[PDB]
Write a protein that binds this ligand. Structure first.
Ligand SMILES: *[C@@H]1O[C@H](CO)[C@@H](O[C@@H]2O[C@H](CO)[C@@H](O)[C@H](O)[C@H]2NC(C)=O)[C@H](O)[C@H]1NC(C)=O
Ligand SMILES: *[C@@H]1O[C@H](CO)[C@@H](O[C@@H]2O[C@H](CO)[C@@H](O)[C@H](O)[C@H]2NC(C)=O)[C@H](O)[C@H]1NC(C)=O
Ligand SMILES: *[C@@H]1O[C@H](CO)[C@@H](O[C@@H]2O[C@H](CO)[C@@H](O)[C@H](O)[C@H]2NC(C)=O)[C@H](O)[C@H]1NC(C)=O
Ligand SMILES: *[C@@H]1O[C@H](CO)[C@@H](O[C@@H]2O[C@H](CO)[C@@H](O)[C@H](O)[C@H]2NC(C)=O)[C@H](O)[C@H]1NC(C)=O
Ligand SMILES: *[C@@H]1O[C@H](CO)[C@@H](O)[C@H](O)[C@H]1NC(C)=O
Ligand SMILES: *[C@@H]1O[C@H](CO)[C@@H](O)[C@H](O)[C@H]1NC(C)=O
Ligand SMILES: *[C@@H]1O[C@H](CO)[C@@H](O)[C@H](O)[C@H]1NC(C)=O
Ligand SMILES: *[C@@H]1O[C@H](CO)[C@@H](O)[C@H](O)[C@H]1NC(C)=O
Ligand SMILES: *[C@@H]1O[C@H](CO)[C@@H](O)[C@H](O)[C@H]1NC(C)=O
Ligand SMILES: *[C@@H]1O[C@H](CO)[C@@H](O)[C@H](O)[C@H]1NC(C)=O
Ligand SMILES: *[C@@H]1O[C@H](CO)[C@@H](O)[C@H](O)[C@H]1NC(C)=O
Lengths: 270, 478, 216, 35, 50, 49
């Protein structure tokens, strides 16, 4: 608001203690986002690893499992998703607490745990179980008896592999299937841009820069001009903060829904 | 600082924000172009000859760049006093146009060049208007006028009852014979020539020696500026936080070499939303860059005032090379020097942490920092986040594991359901029992009812919330 | 005669370097697909009101159209602008000139009373000229290179870069074109807003009208 | 108390305690049938 | 001039009260969401088996 | 806030672009209100009789 000017600070200090809330609200929402991602992803106590030799009754998990040759220990689908979407006057952006490496490790641990042990790893100690018996157990829960799976294993394996290949190709080919994340990024960038663009507004003063009017006038009405600029910028900043609060509430609700879905469906059967 | 910003004498374990810091600019650099359109005022003061007092010459001068300081310090002037015009500040004044009136007068006629004055030449030859005129400069010319000058080459008009308007010249020489009754009752006589010759002699005194007089009048705020005074300049400094008026327009930041290319006519550039990023100087015609000086908030990590009395300082988004510059080496207390240099400058992805040593182990932490690292108090050590345990389950083609014993556990879970049903009075907050306050508030519309409705709605909502969350059964069992 | 000016009349509005940014500007411009009064003065120099800026063009690669005289009365009462060429330098005189019936010039002069200012500067070819005069500043563009791809009509996209500006501080409402003794276009421009696209080298590569079509 | 006030809650703590006691007695003696 | 001074005071205090009311509304909405979740949990995990 | 006036618009245009976002925060919810009722009912692919 002041841009390193002493008289601006002198006039601003008489407006009361407003910066305290203007900063505490942003700190609160930032802490909320950090706790939000930590709660969504950190849902396991250990880090399991896939066995070096893989014989999953016929299924092929090569594309979904992480690959050692990849740079950031990421699978193919994660690389496609990252490559799909793509995106300073007192405003700063703080780095997130958890960078992508820990996220990849968490996803790999969850995937290995659900592949090897099933659902018992989310309710105690992980237990080894062959994959075919796990699929028989899962079919037994939707009304189809286990006798069906053990006589149609090859057909199911082929259908699963064909489906996963087709979905990989579709995701690599589908356009605007990731509109939500791009929309969120665009909204945030537009909000920051329209906040930083407000500096050039005249707000009814002589000019948009403090030094010029300070050096071309005298205090009795210079203070009036300064007060007009100050109050205009206060309303602009308050509007931006309120919009940020509303968007943060929306994202919090969405992330809570995502966490519920992840805890219910990944670690069990719905 | 933490205790001040928290307004308490006890501080719990965690990270807190106290203030922010900026890099102070060091010096200033002024850069103006080579060229300076010199104006030929030498031919004005040092002209070979001047006209008479009744027929002085006028010339038009504009679009000039002349310095008033080069003539103020010259001692070849008898006196330099101006009416309302500052001799020193004339170097920083721009005028619409300038008018010069050069002639020669007698020694005692110098004082006649002033507004609201009575004199023969002040009211008969040249009249100063009743407004602002720049000023008059006079100097001795006895070397070229009192010895080699013409005996009758200088003439003054002794014509009365014909007070001329300001800025008026009447070079028409006519015999002054009335030709009517009011001259001795006769026509033809009482004929006096309008012009008379000066009587001057070589070194005859002070009141008769001819003096060269130039009156400079300046017009302001009548037209776009054409004449302005020159100003000084200096060299440039690189790779420092400098504020400047570089090539006119100002700006602050650090200068770096740039590889971009500019069209042969384009002054400067920018990237987004009036943010200058490239300026070229006329002296070098080389493209450069502007980078804003680094700044940012500070943070204090503490393990709790109860347990200990030692803290770790963290600067956000600052490289090592500016850490001694981030906080001045010899401006704060010597206690800030233990947390200024030395110690341990652990530069990480999220700035620089100073005051805590670095260990290459990894354990679970409790005070987050960011970028995957966090610090804890075992002194204070900052390490990398640990994801937890590490084990591999021996998956096999025909092996299963079946539990044989069981345990029963009890867990707790806390959920808020309500807050305090508060309210604020509508007008008592801003009036406090004053009739003038209510009278002025009645002109601001129905803000009162709008503000009062929301609080009542919230209170009823909280009551309904508690009622629906606790009341589920229709009876009471014992 | 009427001719359809497809997309000519786009120039750099300011002296600020940009790159890969779409800039929406609101200045004086010639609308797209405009109508221009093609003149065929070959065996005709009528009085053309200035109307605050006029487009210009030419096709002849010789020295027949030489000077552009501007003013408001074309009389010794008021100073009149005279900008003429000499095949080696360009001379501009703003001093008071009397009326000229059929002045002839080529590589007239009535009087020079009350003289105040002077200026001296340094398929066929195309010379797109755009003049403007606001707040006492009279400035002129130029583009002296055509594209040898298609004959007839001034089609194609190119930018205009300014050359000269003079702080005369005088009023002009009429102008005449001076010829010699023995086909130039004219268009009118009014302040409609545009959208401009800048290249990575700071060169205008595309312009789109903002008040022409709903798609626009 | 210069223009601001705090309204008391509708349900006092005794009612909440009685609700919790009733719920617990029902879930011990009857189980899920009382729901 | 008293009217000018009272105008300034009213403007400032009205802006402050507006900000306070908005913050209270947001916090109340969030608490309502949390209490709805708590009500669902108590209805399901207590009266039956999850 | 102008009521078909020129001076009001001239004085308003210098305040910046408040109305640019004041006219978008409403269109966002206006668009959202359609998806809200579209995704709650359109849960079938055919129409039975
Ligand atoms: C699982 O799928 C992957 C990829 O779809 C298969 O990888 C193939 O590996 C061979 C041997 O290097 C290559 O020649 C093929 O080009 C790979 N496939 C593709 C699509 O590039 C892998 O063989 C499959 N495994 C099983 C057991 O089906
Ligand atoms: C802090 O500054 C130093 C020196 O300017 C940086 O060290 C150089 O960084 C560049 C990349 O920007 C490398 O190309 C050089 O090899 C580095 N060493 C030199 C120049 O001796 C350092 O990277 C900066 N730190 C941060 C976090 O940006
Ligand atoms: C399952 O674990 C429980 C305790 O975790 C075992 O009960 C213990 O048995 C030993 C030997 O009889 C006693 O000394 C302990 O006092 C018992 N503990 C408790 C809490 O009662 C039980 O034996 C285990 N199951 C089996 C089959 O051995
Ligand atoms: C833009 O400016 C560049 C700077 O010289 C011109 O030169 C091109 O530079 C790129 C970058 O290395 C090369 O890939 C091109 O081959 C260069 N072109 C030529 C003709 O030398 C470039 O021509 C200018 N114009 C464009 C459209 O890029
Ligand atoms: C004189 O002007 C030229 C023009 O580029 C410049 O290079 C040179 O540095 C200037 N000299 C001085 C002393 O300013
Ligand atoms: C103070 O610290 C000691 C040692 O760490 C601990 O035992 C004690 O519980 C702490 N008390 C409080 C009030 O934090
Ligand atoms: C990492 O561990 C190695 C052990 O070989 C040690 O030499 C090094 O100093 C450690 N890095 C740190 C502490 O930053
Ligand atoms: C103006 O231009 C349009 C489009 O080129 C053309 O159809 C029309 O004949 C021209 N003249 C008039 C008078 O509209
Ligand atoms: C010259 O012409 C200008 C403009 O027509 C006029 O203002 C001025 O009085 C004339 N005479 C002189 C001596 O400048
Ligand atoms: C015009 O150019 C010729 C040479 O081509 C030169 O001699 C003459 O002086 C020029 N005219 C003027 C007015 O400079
Ligand atoms: C335009 O001409 C009028 C004469 O009617 C004159 O008063 C005015 O000053 C002129 N405008 C400019 C900018 O010279």
């Amino acid at each position: 608001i002041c841009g390193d000017s002493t008289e601006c600070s002198n006039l601003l200090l008489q407006y009361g203690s407003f910066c305290t809330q203007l900063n505490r609200a942003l700190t609160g929402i930032a802490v909320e986002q950090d706790k939000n991602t930590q709660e969504v992803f950190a849902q396991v106590k250990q880090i399991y690893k896939t066995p070096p030799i893989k014989d999953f009754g016929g299924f092929n998990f090569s594309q979904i499992l992480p690959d050692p040759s990849k740079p950031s220990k990421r699978s193919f689908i994660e690389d496609l998703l990252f490559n799909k979407v793509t995106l300073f006057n007192g405003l700063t952006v703080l780095p997130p607490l958890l960078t992508d490496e820990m996220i990849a490790q968490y996803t790999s641990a969850l995937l290995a745990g659900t592949i090897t042990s099933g659902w018992t790893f989310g309710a105690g100690a992980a237990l080894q179980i062959p994959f075919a018996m796990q699929m028989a157990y899962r079919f037994n829960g939707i009304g189809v008896t286990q006798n069906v799976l053990y006589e149609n294993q090859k057909l199911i394996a082929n259908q699963f592999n064909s489906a996963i290949g087709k979905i990989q190709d579709s995701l690599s080919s589908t356009a605007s299937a990731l509109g939500k994340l791009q929309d969120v990024v665009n909204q945030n960038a537009q909000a920051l841009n329209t906040l930083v663009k407000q500096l050039s507004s005249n707000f009814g003063a002589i000019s948009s820069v403090l030094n010029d009017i300070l050096s071309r006038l005298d205090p009795p009405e210079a203070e009036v001009q300064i007060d007009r600029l100050i109050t205009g910028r206060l309303q602009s900043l308050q509007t931006y903060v309120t919009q940020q609060l509303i968007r943060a509430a929306e994202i919090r609700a969405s992330a809570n829904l995502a966490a519920t879905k992840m805890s219910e469906c990944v670690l069990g059967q719905s | 600082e933490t205790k001040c910003t928290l307004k308490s004498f006890t501080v719990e374990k965690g990270i807190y924000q106290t203030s922010n810091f900026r890099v102070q600019p060091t010096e200033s650099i002024v850069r103006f172009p080579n060229i300076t359109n010199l104006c030929p005022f030498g031919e004005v003061f040092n002209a070979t000859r001047f006209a008479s007092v009744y027929a002085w010459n006028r010339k038009r001068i504009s679009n000039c760049v002349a310095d008033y300081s080069v003539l103020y310090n010259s001692a070849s002037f008898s006196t330099f006093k101006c009416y309302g015009v500052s001799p020193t500040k004339l170097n920083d004044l721009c005028f619409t146009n300038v008018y010069a009136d050069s002639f020669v007068i007698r020694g005692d006629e110098v004082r006649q060049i002033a507004p609201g004055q009575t004199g023969k030449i002040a009211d008969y030859n040249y009249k100063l208007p009743d407004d602002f005129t720049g000023c008059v400069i006079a100097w001795n010319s006895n070397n070229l006028d009192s010895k080699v000058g013409g005996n009758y080459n200088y003439l003054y008009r002794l014509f009365r009852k014909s007070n001329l308007k300001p800025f008026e010249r009447d070079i028409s020489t006519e015999i002054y014979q009335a030709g009517s009754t009011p001259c001795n009752g006769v026509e033809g006589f009482n004929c006096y020539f309008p012009l008379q010759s000066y009587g001057f002699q070589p070194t005859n005194g002070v009141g008769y020696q001819p003096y060269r007089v130039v009156v400079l009048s300046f017009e302001l705020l009548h037209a776009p500026a054409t004449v302005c005074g020159p100003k000084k300049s200096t060299n440039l400094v690189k790779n420092k936080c400098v504020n400047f008026n570089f090539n006119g327009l100002t700006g602050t930041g650090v200068l770096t070499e740039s590889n971009k290319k500019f069209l042969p006519f384009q002054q400067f550039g920018r990237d987004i939303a009036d943010t200058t990023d490239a300026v070229r100087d006329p002296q070098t015609l080389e493209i450069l860059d502007i980078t804003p000086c680094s700044f940012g908030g500070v943070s204090v990590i503490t393990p709790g005032t109860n347990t200990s009395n030692q803290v770790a300082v963290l600067y956000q988004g600052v490289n090592c090379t500016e850490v001694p510059v981030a906080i001045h080496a010899d401006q704060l207390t010597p206690t800030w020097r233990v947390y200024s240099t030395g110690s341990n400058v652990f530069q990480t992805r999220a700035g620089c942490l100073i005051g805590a040593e670095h260990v290459n182990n990894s354990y679970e932490c409790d005070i987050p920092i960011g970028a995957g690292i966090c610090a804890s108090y075992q002194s204070i050590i900052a390490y990398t986040m640990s994801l937890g345990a590490e084990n591999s389950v021996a998956y096999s083609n025909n092996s299963i594991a079946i539990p044989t014993n069981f345990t029963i556990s009890v867990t707790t879970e806390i959920l808020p359901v309500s807050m305090t049903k508060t309210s604020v009075d509508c007008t008592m907050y801003i009036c406090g029992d004053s009739t003038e306050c209510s009278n002025l508030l009645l002109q601001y519309g129905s803000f009162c009812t709008q503000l009062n409705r929301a609080l009542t709605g919230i209170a009823v909502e909280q009551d309904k919330n508690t009622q629906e969350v606790f009341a589920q059964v229709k009876q009471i069992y014992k | 005669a009427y001719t359809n000016s497809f997309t000519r009349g786009v120039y750099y509005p300011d002296k600020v370097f940009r790159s890969s940014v779409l800039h929406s500007t609101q200045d004086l411009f010639l609308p797209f697909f405009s109508n221009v009064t093609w003149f065929h003065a070959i065996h005709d120099n009528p009085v053309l009101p200035f109307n605050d800026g006029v487009y210009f063009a030419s096709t002849e690669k010789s020295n027949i159209i030489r000077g552009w005289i501007f003013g408001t009365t074309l009389d010794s009462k008021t100073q009149s602008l005279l900008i003429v060429n000499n095949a080696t330098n360009v001379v501009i005189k703003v001093c008071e000139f009397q009326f000229c019936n059929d002045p002839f010039l080529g590589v007239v002069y009535s009087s020079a009373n009350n003289c105040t200012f002077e200026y001296v500067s340094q398929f066929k070819n195309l010379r797109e000229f755009v003049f403007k005069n606001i707040d006492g500043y009279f400035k002129i563009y130029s583009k002296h290179t055509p594209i040898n791809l298609v004959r007839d009509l001034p089609q194609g996209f190119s930018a205009l870069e300014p050359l000269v500006d003079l702080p005369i501080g005088i009023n002009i409402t009429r102008f005449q074109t001076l010829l010699a003794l023995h086909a130039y276009y004219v268009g009118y421009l009014q302040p409609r807003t545009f959208l401009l696209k800048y290249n990575e080298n700071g060169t205008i590569t595309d312009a789109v009208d903002c008040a022409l079509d709903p798609l626009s």
